[PDB]
């Protein structure tokens, strides 16, 4: 579950990294950063896609990627950080 | 369910597209982009409504549209991407 | 329930409106707009508090106000828009 | 529960405050502010990490910290503000 959500999140972020570095001309790390803050809804206060292709892609990317990213965050905390903390609350 | 949430999400986005292109003078694609990142809470780091009508509309648009948009995202992932992935996890 | 969440959301937004217009010097509508996009997590890409008092207040405002605002959105959609749409799905 | 989530949220914010003030050169209050709006997904419309170390750290910080911060907000409202309001609804 967590492994598949992890793999799935990685693939979605790789696609965004390739898209923004190619179409929007961002350095790969900046494309990855933009993909991450976009799908987590944090957003970036400096950059917004400048091309129409970039705007359309971003719209579709958000709708398809938000659910998955939050599912991963949802499990990464409930099935990986909770116990590591819950079990660690046992005297 | 997914079909109605899909239709309902589309109508909400069409209203925002018409509103921002008319009152805030945005090109339609930019108005659609702003509507999408606003209702998904991603936000835009470059544009904020410049008119008071735009600010009031945005406030009301957020309260009314956020629930619907996330319900759609909630189903688009649970009832359309999960199985397509879950059923695909079957050896 | 919806009435109390509505009243409670209004009071929280009035406090933010008074705070930002006084301490950060924003016009009331801009202070209300900032309060709304902050508590809904949309954010504003143009304005961030400029004073240390404003930054501290914003931090506390977010932690205390986010839960309430989303509870209101949660009910405004589940107990006020769903049926109005659900009951309207009945042939 | 609320006490542990409170302590855990504080430690996560202290780490971000130390990181951004050191690597990104922000004044401590600005580093704390950035950490808070980032983990709550509000975002900041003015500042984005300028260094690659800062961008990578922010990506990891978001994935690890978002779940915890929202769990805290989730309990701070359900187990600390609801009753204080619910019990106060009793004539
Ligand atoms: Ca900006
Ligand atoms: Cs945001
Ligand atoms: Na958000
Ligand atoms: Na934002």
Q: Do B67 and C85 touch (CB under 8 A)?
A: no
Helical H runs in C1-91?
Answer: 2-23, 28-39, 52-78, 82-86
**How far apart are alpha carbons A56 and A80 in whole angstroms?**
35
Chain B positions touching chain C (beta carbons under 8 Å): 4, 8, 38, 41-49, 52, 55-56, 58-59, 62-64, 66-68, 71
CATH code where residue B85 lies? 1.10.287.70
Degrees, nearest 5: CA angle B59-D45-D66: 85
D interface residues, B as partner, C-beta within 8 Å: 41, 43, 45
CB-side neighbour CA atoms (13 Å) of B28: 3
10 Å Cβ neighbour count for C43? 29
Q: What residues in chain D have their Cβ under 8 A from chain A's Cβ atoms?
A: 4, 8, 38, 41-49, 52, 55-56, 58-59, 62-64, 66-68, 71
Question: How many Å apart are CA B49 and CA B31, to the nearest integer?
Answer: 11
Number of domains present in the structure of chain B? 1
Instruction: State the smallest CA–CA distance between residue B24 and chain A in angstroms.
Output: 18
Distance CA C15, CA C23 (A): 12
Name every residue whose Cβ is closer than 8 Å to that of residue D21 and which is 6 or more positions away in sequence: D27, D28, D30, D31
Per the structure, the complete domain to which residue C19 belongs is given by: 1-91
Residue C55 to residue C49: CA distance in whole angstroms: 6
CA distance D35 to A39: 18
Q: Are D37 and C57 in contact (CB under 8 A)?
A: no
For residue C46, what is the nearest residue in chain A, using CA coordinates? Answer: A45
**Rounded Cα–Cα distance for residues C71 and B40 (Å):** 16
Q: Which of D70, D56, D74 is closest to D12 using CA atoms?
A: D70
């Amino acid at each position: 579950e967590f492994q598949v959500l992890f793999v799935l999140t990685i693939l979605t972020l790789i696609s965004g990294t390739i898209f923004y570095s190619t179409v929007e001309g961002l350095r790969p790390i900046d494309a990855l950063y933009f993909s991450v803050v976009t799908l987590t809804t944090v957003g970036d206060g400096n950059f917004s896609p400048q091309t129409d292709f970039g705007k359309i892609f971003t719209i579709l990317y958000i709708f398809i990627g938000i659910g998955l990213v939050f599912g991963f965050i949802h499990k990464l905390a409930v099935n990986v950080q909770l116990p590591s903390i819950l079990s660690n609350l046992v005297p």
